[PDB]
Amino acid sequence: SGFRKMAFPSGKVEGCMVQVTCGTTTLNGLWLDDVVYCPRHVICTSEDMLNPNYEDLLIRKSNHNFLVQAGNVQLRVIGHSMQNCVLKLKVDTANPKTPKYKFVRIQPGQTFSVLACYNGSPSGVYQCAMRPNFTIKGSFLNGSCGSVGFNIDYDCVSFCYMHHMELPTGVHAGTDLEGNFYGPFVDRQTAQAAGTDTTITVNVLAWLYAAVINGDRWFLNRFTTTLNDFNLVAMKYNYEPLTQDHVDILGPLSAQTGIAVLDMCASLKELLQNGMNGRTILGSALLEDEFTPFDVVRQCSGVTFQ
Amino acid sequence: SGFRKMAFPSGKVEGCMVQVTCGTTTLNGLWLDDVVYCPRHVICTSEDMLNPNYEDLLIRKSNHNFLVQAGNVQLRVIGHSMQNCVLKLKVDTANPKTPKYKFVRIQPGQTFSVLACYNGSPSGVYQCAMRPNFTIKGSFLNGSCGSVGFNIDYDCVSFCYMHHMELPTGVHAGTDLEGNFYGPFVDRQTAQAAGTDTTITVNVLAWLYAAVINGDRWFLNRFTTTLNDFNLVAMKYNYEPLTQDHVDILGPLSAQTGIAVLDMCASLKELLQNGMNGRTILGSALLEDEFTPFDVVRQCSGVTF
Ligand SMILES: O=C(NC[C@H]1CCCO1)NC1CCCC1
Ligand SMILES: [Cl-]
User: Fold this and answer.
1) Virtual CA dihedral for B272, B276, B281, B284, nearest 10 degrees?
2) Nearest chain B CA: its distance from A121 CA (Å)
3) Does B31 share its domain with B168?
4) Which of A102, A132, A154, B116 is the most exposed place for a label (fewest CB within 10 A)?
């Protein structure tokens, strides 16, 4: 039993991290097979920050303007190309530590692990979610660009995020491993701001189901709600609307606990109205929204504590 | 910027985990050099666990009674012995992925990373604190025994914890890697309860410093206090006493922020007496106590391995 923010074991990703330097700029790259992936903004100088013409800057680079270092080894770059906002450096050696891997673009609400790195070396691992406003609430310092987000479902590493920048409110933005930004952001230093963020309702509901599995019952009630009435209330607290898709996703947790999804929705409406009254749920005095239905089933027993 | 509960990268430990089976029991072992470490309770039947005589159970066993699997490879056990509540299985092959390591016993208040494992496969990593009552608040299912906890210093892994059991309240108890329990626990199926727990004051202060570094400042005030005055308040709230060593350890953060420890102590006094008055700190409505001063400096400085 117990319930914790849990990251994937980072080892398979650790063996892929390298350092990339171009000019005076050093950041992280991801070395899979014979390609190193990194943010294309590595090729910018100071006057290129507002309105870089990436095609123009890249054509001006030779292979030997890129210093790539894997531990103590220099890897020789033998080719370069750009894909959207990611740079792809061809090197003369395939990474012998390359895991089984794939690239996946995720949707808001999904969770993943981040391996934060500086100078091609891992600093730490933690769990994040893609926020509804397409940002992530990370922990990143200068030098952390090129750090990646990943899942490991069943021996294969699914890469879903690469870190590019910090926005003015202190939240983070980046791309998939095909170089497409999450959300409306661009790799320019022009003024940009995240939209107002909301709470990931389906994830909160999942976490309430986790609480019940771990033996909490204090927040349950005898009421139910229509889906529509729930949404009208929830939106007044800056909660995301719950779709029928979301209702379906919670069906297994519903069945394992014997509490219907709209039954649980009524608990959540009550909690938003009353607060916790000095109590906690699973070690929090807030409603947690960074655990998916899938995370909860994976982390929990298949036996409820009644 | 930003601040998260962050584990050490687990790769160096992932390469050390194996599966150990004795009779019908499978759990995890730690393979370092030519020895596999695991909980001694692996050898017990259900009946045994009520009142075990480990000495007697162990002499009765031989090498071939222990099945050690590292992925698809069977290790040959060539010897066995017990040290406290840990079993040591000598194997015919040194682990070629053995990292630079040592065995270290930690103190209550200190944090570490747990690599939760099942059937010898790493499953998840998370950061824990050793509670004042010597439990950890972990996340463990059946098959997790023998999972380990550790810190990293440069390239050196310090192993500090091996998971043995769950207590009735859902908290967890285990040993150091020399088999000595943390806390007043024994490895048998009998009635055991954790003592009443306390809050780790120096860690709360470190977290308030992390909040300030990240621009979260509402709880700061013009006041200061004395160790004596604070401790009298704190002890009233089941907060551990703040020692002078604790104050010295916070010195780096006090200097980096311009909030002196006793200045920050005055803020924490008010939070205890008054609550958070509807606010949050670093996205929490509780006072978090599972980050050490060292944790905060490391995370906010960007130390690497
Ligand atoms: O439908 C999903 N995301 C998009 C929604 C969430 C906020 C508004 O739009 N599902 C995610 C949660 C479960 C795993 C992925
Ligand atoms: Cl997704």
Assistant:
1) 90
2) 6
3) no
4) A154
Calculate helix-pair angle for B201-213, B293-301, nearest 10 degrees. 20
DSSP codes, B160-181: EEEEEEE-TTS-EEEE-TTSPB
- The answer on B231 and B211 residing in a single domain is yes
Which residues does chain A have within 8 Å of residue B125's beta carbon, measured at their own beta carbons? 6-10, 125
Please check whether residues B77 and B154 belong to one and the same domain. Answer: no
Residues 6+ positions from A85 with CB-CB distance below 8 Å: A39, A40, A41, A164, A175, A179, A180, A181, A187
* Residue A4 belongs to some domain of the structure: yes
* Residue A239 in domain: yes
Which ligand 1 atom sits nearest the alpha carbon of residue A200? 7
- Co-location of B6 and B104 in the same domain: yes
Going by DSSP bridges, is the β-strand pair A156-166/A101-103 parallel, antiparallel, or unpaired? parallel
Structure method: X-ray
Nearest CA to ligand 1 atom 5: A108
- Chain B residues inside the 8 Å CB shell of A171: 2
Beta bridge pairs of residue B163:
B174
Other CB atoms within 10 A of residue B155 CB: 10
Domain count, chain B: 3
Round to whole Å and give the CA distance between B28 and A78.
44
What is the CA(A183)–ligand 2 centre distance, in A? 14
Q: Which residues contact B240 (CB under 8 A, 6 or more apart)?
A: B109, B132, B198, B199, B200, B201, B202, B234
What is the C-alpha separation between A295 and A6, in angstroms, rounded?
A: 9
Within a domain: A306: no
Asked if the C-beta of A301 comes within 8 angstroms of chain B's C-beta atoms, the answer is: yes
Whether A120 and A78 share a structural domain: no
Residue corresponding to tokens 């090498």: B63
Cα–Cα nearest to A290, from A231, A228, A207, A234:
A207
Are residues B125 and B205 both part of a single domain?
no
The label of the residue with tokens 């909660």 reads A239
Q: Is residue B126 a contact partner of residue B139, using CB atoms and an 8 Å limit? A: yes
Q: Which of B182, B197, B212 is the last residue of a domain?
A: B197
φ, ψ for residue A13, nearest 5 deg: -85, -40
Which of A127, A202, A289 has the most ligand 1 atoms within 8 A of CB, as the residue to mutate? A202
Between the CA of A109 and the centroid of ligand 1 the distance, in Å, is 4
The terminus-to-terminus CA distance of chain A in angstroms comes to: 13
Angle, CA of B52, B55 and B58, to the nearest 5° = 95
CA dist A180 and B4 (Å) reads 26
CATH of the domain at B143: 2.40.10.10
In angstroms, what is the span from residue A144 Cα to ligand 2's centroid? 24
The residue type of A221 is N
**Distance from C-alpha of B260 to C-alpha of B264, rounded to nearest angstrom:** 6
Domain presence at residue A36: yes
CATH number of residue A226's parent domain: 1.10.1840.10
The sign of the torsion formed by the CA atoms of A273, A278, A279, A284 equals: positive
Same domain, A75 and A107: no
- Kindly state whether residues B225 and B165 are assigned to the same domain: no
Q: Supply B101's token pair.
A: 């390591």
Q: Residue A278 is part of which domain span?
A: 198-301
Domain closes at, from A197, A228, A257:
A197
